Design a protein around this nucleic acid. Structure first.
Ligand code: MG
Ligand code: MG
Ligand code: MG
Ligand code: MG
Ligand code: MG
Ligand code: MG
Ligand code: MG
Ligand code: MG
Ligand code: MG
Ligand code: MG
Ligand code: MG
Ligand code: MG
Ligand code: MG
Ligand code: MG
Ligand code: MG
Ligand code: MG
Ligand code: MG
Ligand code: MG
Ligand code: MG
Ligand code: MG
Ligand code: MG
Ligand code: MG
Ligand code: MG
Ligand code: MG
Ligand code: MG
Ligand code: MG
Ligand code: MG
Ligand code: MG
Ligand code: MG
Ligand code: MG
Ligand code: MG
Ligand code: MG
Ligand code: MG
Ligand code: MG
Ligand code: MG
Ligand code: MG
Ligand code: MG
Ligand code: MG
Ligand code: MG
Ligand code: MG
Ligand code: MG
Ligand code: MG
Ligand code: MG
Lengths: 126, 179, 78, 136
RNA sequence: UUUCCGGUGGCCAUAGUGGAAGGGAAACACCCGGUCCCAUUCCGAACCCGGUCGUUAAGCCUUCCAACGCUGAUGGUACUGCACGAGGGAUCGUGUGGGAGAGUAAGACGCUGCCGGAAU
RNA sequence: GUCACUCAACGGAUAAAAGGUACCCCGGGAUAACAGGCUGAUCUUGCCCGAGCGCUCAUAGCGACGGCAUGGUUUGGCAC
RNA sequence: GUCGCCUCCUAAAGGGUAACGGAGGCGCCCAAAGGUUCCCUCAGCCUGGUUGGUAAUCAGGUGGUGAGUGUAAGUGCACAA
RNA sequence: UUCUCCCCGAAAUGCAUUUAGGUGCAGCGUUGCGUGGUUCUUGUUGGAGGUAGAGCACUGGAUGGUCUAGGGGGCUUAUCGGCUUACCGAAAUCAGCCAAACUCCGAAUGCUGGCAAGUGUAGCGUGGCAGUGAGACGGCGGGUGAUAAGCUUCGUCGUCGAGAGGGAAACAGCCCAGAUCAUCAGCUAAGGCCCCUAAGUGGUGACUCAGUGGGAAAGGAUGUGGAGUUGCGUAGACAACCAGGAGGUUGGCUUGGAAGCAGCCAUCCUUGAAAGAGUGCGUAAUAGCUCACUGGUCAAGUGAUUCCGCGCCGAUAAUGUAGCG
């Protein structure tokens, strides 16, 4: 469900995030060679999916929602780094190697940056 | 009242076919409704003109193979200089039912010689019943002068003829002469 | 007598689509000369300094819509 | 004399005078009216003459509508001059009349004297025109 | 497998706008802080960080409303390629092909892919 | 590699250039003056409408505003 | 009066198309008004507010392009160019 | 600028020019060599568009209505405040409109690809030799000009140029048709068939009576045929012909006179089977003559009104009929 225009009556923070996400997506686009890693950073969780934007499907994905990580005691940044390591491992399993990072309207910092560096250490070329 | 018109199937379409029909002194018509596919027919020119002399008449179209069916002329394309009917849109009506139509406004009132009544509209969209179509809607401005104006929400409309158009705009105006 | 304050005009620039839909093109072949992006660069199409849309790869030219934009794509040849 | 307050371009191509009336073929304000049966150009002087005739005949009662407006400027080549040296200066203002166009309308007047006033007006126009009504 | 919901695309209003009613299990969100990375051309509003108590009031979600907007035939008309014809002239008509725009009936309170969630 | 031209008459005759000819001299009707021809804006001669003026009385006689043409003799347009 | 260049119309929905046809511009400017990266959304309107007025700055509401674009015009650009 | 025949066969455009009647390059001709369906036509299939038309979303132009900020005029009288706002009025809004340089829209054609079929021998490359670079008119779409020109300048097709033959009275540019030669054969095209003049004073049905045909406008007209719509009509219509065609009332501002007739109006009432403060003619001013309306002998159709076909007037220069040859 995408509609170009930012939905009116949306909250101010949601509109700001949607606009920033759109302007990043303006140049970010995932192909089979370099799929697009999208990280949605909700207030309590981060959900990462590697998407082939040509076909419109997700190849691999991960999130803090996984039961193996729900009870993994740690700070938000540490949990995001664990998610990044997991998603890098799954990308290696699927044979992705190189991706393009889509911050999805958020600043590349904090939890998002920790997850990105964790994936880089796991072995993703980006 | 019901006006009966004999019609037969029309199958040739286009400007050439329409010209040939009008030279044959018939008139093309398309009859459509809310239940069936549009039917393309041709009518007798003289009979169509006689029927369409009045405004919003209830017509019954008879086709030899088919059965008579009830319609109203919703859009009549007439010639501009000559008065001939060039094309008819017939909208089918389900006998016992309700319809939206236009009824003509006229002035039948007299005021002081200084002021003259004026109509702000030719027709008003009035939701009436089939068997009682108001031929004319009449408003009387007698004994009223100066700059009084009449909107669409105060009319002596006949029974069963509800107003569908907007009631927040003027319909009749009386004002001093063309000074 | 009189005179005209007009009579100046610029040389013909010869804009417009140079390769229409389905036409086979080579890489780098110019597809449309234009001022501004009446057509945006689509897949396999690059946009130059003067908004010329050219082919980034061999294939067939198609005109389409990408999101809300009129775009020109070059489908790679089968 | 109807002259527009301003126009975007004072020197324009001659208006197309082909085809029937694009719009305004039906009475919209008055009860009776003049309908042009032939196309042509209608200058502001002719419009004013016809309006004066109608108003003067109908005296004080009734009201007149001028449906058309002479907003198209017509230039004139400078007199006694050879061809060339640019377009001329606007000299006439016209309205583009096509067959079926309603030019003038009248209301608040009995039909017979309305007809006579329309006849007076029509005898001032440069194209054929007829008296029309809302079928009475 | 299904239902519901959160993300991420595609079509880009038949999806919007406005009104009404109802919903939160996970989730989303507002919310609570600012000690820490970081931040405000002032402001922890925002960005960022730390929590998930509180709250479905709003976002979001579900149902309903053609009301504004949007979509929209058939037939006819305008125009028109070709071939002719008629007027003193503006210009007009016909044959043979194509054929709108406006308007009319009507449609429509979105459609569809992938991933995840909680239950089945 | 770069510089020096309002070479602007901007594909840029010379680095360097204004006038007079009724004293004039040596292809074009491709092009003007005269006449003819076309056209008819202008001119001209009529005509339609009838506001008004004519004690009264539109039309004895006049004719405002507008409209339609004739003639080709006026000034022009065209350059056959 | 004009002569080179640019934009629009004429130009008859590719391109091209003449007249002493109709409109305007150019002979620059900018060390940022270039490159890149991230962020932002205007004009107008309504309401409230010291000086303060139609209009300075501020607040809330509305408002999708009608603002803006170094410079003409067109094509673009609110995903912002 | 001098002999012949055979084959093909232009251009009068673009660009540049101390250039505009010159010239270079390209376009178009021919020819050698090479390449062979690449050209072209039609169908089919797919593209980009913003013209015609249309529309009013935008930008301008615009009519009327509603409504109104705000300006003008007054007074009570003003510092207000009120009555006014019977005046003006941006904006907004409703309805009808306008646009080469407006567009929410949007053709037909044209252009350009794929495919298929058809096709003269078309297309292309590369050499030799050119000529041309003053065009004309007609159809269609436009600019300049005045709705002008056998005008001027473009787009496009045709002919002429460089094209004889047939038609157009004659008549480069219009229509038919592209002449290899011969023929004292036939069929046709455009156009024609009374005679000039080849073929019908053809057949059948309508219309015209103007010599319209065989030039023209606004406008005007009981011309004439046909097709409607509609009022009245043997309760007896329209004409024609005998009686009532008038009281109150010389209705009022006029004007020595407006009594029914100078101009402008409420556009009434009555003795009654019948009538208008009143329509023509008359008239200093009233008189009166005479009509719609009422009886009757007669009485079968009249009175409007619209559209269509063909005609009429408007119509009008100078050597001689003289605008069918
Ligand atoms: Mg650039
Ligand atoms: Mg550049
Ligand atoms: Mg309209
Ligand atoms: Mg529609
Ligand atoms: Mg349509
Ligand atoms: Mg030069
Ligand atoms: Mg030199
Ligand atoms: Mg001397
Ligand atoms: Mg000499
Ligand atoms: Mg000459
Ligand atoms: Mg010559
Ligand atoms: Mg001469
Ligand atoms: Mg001579
Ligand atoms: Mg002369
Ligand atoms: Mg000349
Ligand atoms: Mg010439
Ligand atoms: Mg073009
Ligand atoms: Mg074209
Ligand atoms: Mg040229
Ligand atoms: Mg030959
Ligand atoms: Mg147009
Ligand atoms: Mg040459
Ligand atoms: Mg030359
Ligand atoms: Mg030349
Ligand atoms: Mg020439
Ligand atoms: Mg030429
Ligand atoms: Mg020509
Ligand atoms: Mg012209
Ligand atoms: Mg010529
Ligand atoms: Mg020659
Ligand atoms: Mg020839
Ligand atoms: Mg010949
Ligand atoms: Mg001949
Ligand atoms: Mg001959
Ligand atoms: Mg024969
Ligand atoms: Mg023949
Ligand atoms: Mg002879
Ligand atoms: Mg005979
Ligand atoms: Mg005979
Ligand atoms: Mg005669
Ligand atoms: Mg004659
Ligand atoms: Mg005549
Ligand atoms: Mg003859």
């Amino acid at each position: 469900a995408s509609t170009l225009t930012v939905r009116k009556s949306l909250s101010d923070r949601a509109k700001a995030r949607a606009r920033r996400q759109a302007r990043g997506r303006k140049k970010i686009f995932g192909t089979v060679e370099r799929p697009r890693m999208v990280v949605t950073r909700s207030s309590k969780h981060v959900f990462v999916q590697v998407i082939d934007d040509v076909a419109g499907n997700t190849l691999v994905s991960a999130s803090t929602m996984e039961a193996e990580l729900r009870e993994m005691s740690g700070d938000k940044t540490a949990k995001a780094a664990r998610v990044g390591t997991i998603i890098g491992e799954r990308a290696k399993a699927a044979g992705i190697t190189k991706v393009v990072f889509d911050k999805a309207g958020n600043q590349y910092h904090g939890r998002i940056a920790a997850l990105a560096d964790a994936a880089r250490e796991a072995g993703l070329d980006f | 009242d019901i006006i009966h018109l004999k019609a037969e199937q029309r199958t040739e379409f286009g400007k050439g076919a329409a010209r040939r029909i009008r030279r044959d002194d018939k008139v093309p018509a398309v009859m459509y409704g809310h239940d069936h596919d549009p039917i393309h027919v041709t009518l007798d020119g003289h009979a169509t003109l006689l029927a369409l002399r009045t405004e919003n008449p209830l017509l019954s179209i008879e086709i030899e193979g088919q059965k008579p069916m009830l319609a109203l002329p919703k859009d009549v394309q007439r010639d501009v200089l000559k008065g001939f009917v060039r094309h008819v849109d017939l909208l089918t009506v389900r006998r016992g039912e309700k319809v939206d139509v236009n009824v003509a406004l006229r002035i039948t009132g007299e005021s002081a010689p200084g002021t003259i009544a004026m109509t702000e509209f030719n027709e008003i969209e009035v939701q009436a019943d089939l068997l009682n179509i108001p031929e004319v809607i009449e408003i009387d401005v007698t004994g009223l002068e100066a700059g009084t104006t009449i909107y669409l929400g105060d009319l002596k409309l006949p029974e069963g003829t509800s107003l569908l158009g907007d009631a927040e705009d003027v319909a009749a105006t009386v004002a001093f002469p063309e000074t | 007598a009189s005179s005209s304050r007009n009579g100046r005009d610029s040389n013909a620039q010869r804009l417009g689509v140079k390769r229409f839909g389905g036409q086979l093109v080579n890489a780098g072949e110019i597809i449309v000369r234009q001022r501004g992006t009446h057509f945006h660069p689509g897949d396999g199409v690059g946009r130059g300094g003067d908004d010329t849309l050219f082919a980034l790869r061999d294939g067939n030219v198609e005109f389409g819509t990408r999101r809300g934009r009129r775009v020109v794509n070059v489908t790679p040849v089968e | 004399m109807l002259i527009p307050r301003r126009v975007k371009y004072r020197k324009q191509h001659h208006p197309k005078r082909t085809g029937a009336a694009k719009g305004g073929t039906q009475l919209a304000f008055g009860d009776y009216g003049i309908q042009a049966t032939e196309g042509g150009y209608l200058t502001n002087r002719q419009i004013e003459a016809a309006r004066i005739a109608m108003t003067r005949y109908i005296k004080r009662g009734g009201k007149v509508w001028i449906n058309v407006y002479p907003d198209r400027p017509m230039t004139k080549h400078p007199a006694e001059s050879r061809m060339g040296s640019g377009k001329g200066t606007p000299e006439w203002w016209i309205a583009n009349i096509k067959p079926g166009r309603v030019l003038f309308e009248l209301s608040g007047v009995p039909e017979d004297v309305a007809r006579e006033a329309m006849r007076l007006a029509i005898h001032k126009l440069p194209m054929k025109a007829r008296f029309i009504s809302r079928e009475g």
